[model samples]
Target chain A: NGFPEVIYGAGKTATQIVGIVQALSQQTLPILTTRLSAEKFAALQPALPTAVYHATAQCMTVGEQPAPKTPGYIAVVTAGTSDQPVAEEAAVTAETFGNRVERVYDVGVAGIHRLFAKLDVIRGARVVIVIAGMEGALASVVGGLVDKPVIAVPTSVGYGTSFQGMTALLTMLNSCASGITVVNIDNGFGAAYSASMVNQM
Target chain B: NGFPEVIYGAGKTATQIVGIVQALSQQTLPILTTRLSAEKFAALQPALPTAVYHATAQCMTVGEQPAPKTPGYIAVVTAGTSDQPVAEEAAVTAETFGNRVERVYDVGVAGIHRLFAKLDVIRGARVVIVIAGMEGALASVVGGLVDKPVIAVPTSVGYGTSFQGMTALLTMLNSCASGITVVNIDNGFGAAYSASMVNQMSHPQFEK
Candidate 1:
């Protein structure tokens, strides 16, 4: 009955971010701030000293609480090294909301064998967050391999003409894979929030 | 045939914001930034000498060019005064992209009269960016009154249990109104970008 997963809007303002964090701080501890900017992180620290900012990942966390306990684990898989930031955001946010997260990184469609090798992990997770960018070919590939929920997060990590991620967003939205639910582009927080909701269901 | 309505992803790192702006600037003029932090604004000033920051609105604007012409105007309408910042983002972004813009503020559902007074303004525009928070009911109301495209923007403004604008997002997504597309919560740039694309259709070709 107590699910802590919250969908984050990556492009929102710091004022909006703090408003979200402060509101959550009332009911939850070990709060997570995924896809947060350094300015937002610095501004948040003054109001929320509990928040711990992660640099490379560009995420922030609050509280020393343990991860949420769920009936099944969430397997978060990323296509390439570039998708790691988004993949990690989904993984960390899911854990903060109390779900055990197993990760598979750099296993994109370019090397199908790498992903195929992780079949056990893919099948084992209750749900999967398939994070990808640039052509966005991984979601369908991952969706094909998993019978569980496939939460696709399209990152803003592609080259020119990628439209800062609009291309990836459209790709994920139009995936041939059935039952594929996509969060917005660079929406790692929404992916985690949905995964947490699925876990509870 | 060209418009420069770029999205400034607020709350993102300075490097990320500058990177996107620079890319958009190479192709488009009158680049603008909205919902930026004071630190992010200062950091970007050196790289973008023309970037002007608006502290109260938390927005930034660049380029000294004249506004472009369009087939239609975008009526930036909001429910309450608190939603003005986002309304400003949509209005400024659309204007910078060369679309004529009209503002309709304090026209939330709670006070139907204020919104009704602007029926001519809302109906006449080629497209509308209806920015709302709380229940996000205003979009639905505008959706019903006009045949124009209504791009709904859900702001992160509301009380406890509003889920930091997610509730508004869900409401807009589930709106009974047709001819509407919903963007991310608090995504003023995304809304304006889409609106500009639609409004540009009215302009003559070879105008780039």
Candidate 2:
């Protein structure tokens, strides 16, 4: 099929999310949703009877088929647990957009070993979305570690000096590390769309 | 005197906000804190004994003030009530940065005439910060009405398809109106910072 991949469900009503899935049942090679609520899943049950919702991951999917074409896999990484929502949004979006995605969560600078341990996975990815909060220094570290494109997202998840994310945002923009494009704070949707575009290239 | 215009206290502890104000007070001019919590205010009272706080406005200021600058003033306008937090941030930051700021709150598109009613006041502003949510079409409306540089801020204030503000963000980016620079969603700090930078260009910078 010639359809493009994509993730759904965020800022969309449950019924709307299901309706999109029902419509995509035919060209169903690629689509995913993460960070879904039980209420939303219950709302989609009637329309998407075959859809599977993963409880632990809070993820849902429609297609049983593999993605048609992908330039390479996208690696979604987060600096801290607080950044999970943004990471999930990016991972699901990349997978939906016909790109394979691998997520590495809670591997921030406070625990450098966690990130270092995943060097192989990091190097293998075609593109990376680095979701972070606080000082947002993770983007600089990852940017230095990898040669691929890094989409830095500053989350609204830190305390004082974070300014609900302005601190992280300014830190990311002023990142000494080069080749990094910064998106809005807590802006998973923008990161997903932009990441998919970069992954395709 | 030469110094950065204001100290933003949204996330900082009250002691930190007060500490900055205390230090700034020694140099002497005017200081302000936007979005400061009551707890922080309590912590700041000892240092800024003469400081005044506006509960409804959520603003803090200390030291001497100045007469309003010439060439009209900088206007901070909002499309809806929910955007007041951000609107206040921009206004206070502009004031701390040494520009006269006029506020026009809750003039959303649904009540277009309210915006039209104040057209004369709005037109007089040298620059403007248009904070909006929902469809974020207000920036375009304001941009069309005035020749001033519009700093369009998209607050995360709506439900469904708003993407917690990405929809509004995209709308601002694709605005038919030119001369509008878009900042992050709910990024009152960034908007204020950018406005201060622009205002500083015209202010008579004096070395202490």
Candidate 3:
């Protein structure tokens, strides 16, 4: 409940982000804005020195990260080098909420043995957030391998027919691995919220 | 230059097809009506006996298939039994235009042996129309093994998240294999049309 009020920073201008950040700051509720560009962050820096930016995740936080509220952690899994941004968003969001996060990156299905090396880390978590693109079969495969609640985020990394990540979105949606509920394409922050809450269960 | 005029029959009324067919009959040009329903076909039957319907493909042909203008043939391939209708749409469309078509069906990549058994049939033609759903890995794998032009059609098969056929569409579009140009989801007729163009590679109806 103490998590920052989320701000989607992509479409809104830098001025809009600053205004929203200032409004949240005035109330002292704390704020977390995602998808903010570095250029916009530079503009918001002086306007809101209270706001801190996580470069890789492109999230701006205007308050302190809370202490660990849950004993169990959320695991964020990714497929390739390109998916780091989306993966980091989930990781940072979970950590910001005071829920522990374990990052397991570059374990794509094409070379799944890498995934096996980290099986204990993934399987040990209370909830799992899987992020991938290009058919996104990793979510389904991982879902079957683990008993934890699997939250899937389809990324937009692929080219051509990927249609900006729809392929992975649909693949996860249709997976036979019953527990998986797919979030929107590249909604990394959303995946964090989902897994953070699921870990409580 | 002699290709039949196409009628997209999904949204049109039976009366409209009759009117259009009768209207075009005056000009003496042949016609090919696709996505037509059986009930509609029955309604059009008494009104137009000259029309020959290919039930499996849901297409109606209003004139004789012209003699082949090109020696090369088109290969209509499918990944599974459910893809038959889409496969037939391409197959029938090719045959209706007097372009020879060789069919290879129920050869999905999940069963690699089946696809291998039909490799020659798939590679023998000037162009190959590959239809599949799910991850649609069939298009990718076939594109890798064949040298002919590949027209991939993503069918509306597989369950949830299949998003009708977009999953397969994107899968084929992003596949690692080269020489693949994908058409729309379940667009059998479009695939056939493209393949026929390649079949008659040597072209032109209008003078320069």
Comparison by TM-score, 1 against 3, better one = 3
lDDT of 2 by residue, B1-208 (tens): 2434466577788767766776667665777666777667777778778887765447787765565444457778899999987787677666666678889889989989999998888877766778999898888788777755566788899998878887776676555224455666776655655454344335669967
CAPRI band for model 2: incorrect
* Superposition TM-score, candidate 3 onto the true structure: 0.58
Best by TM-score: 3
| Candidate 3, B45-76: lDDT as tens digits | 99998899889899998988777778888888
lDDT of each: 0.73, 0.71, 0.82
Ranking by DockQ: 3, 2, 1
All models, DockQ values? 0.02, 0.02, 0.14
Per-residue accuracy of model 1 over B1-208 as CA lDDT, tens digit each:
3545444446588888888888777756676667787888889889988888766567788786455676568889898888888787777777776778889988999989998998999998877888899899998888777766577888898899888887777677555224455666666665676566556544458875
The predicted structure with the larger lDDT, 1 or 3, is 3
Question: Candidate 3: which stretches are off by over 4 Å?
Answer: A1-132, A135-156, A160-166, A172-201, B27-29, B202-208
Residue B4 error, candidate 2, Å = 4.3
What are the fnat scores of the candidates, in the order listed?
A: 0.00, 0.00, 0.25
> All candidates' TM-scores?
0.48, 0.48, 0.58
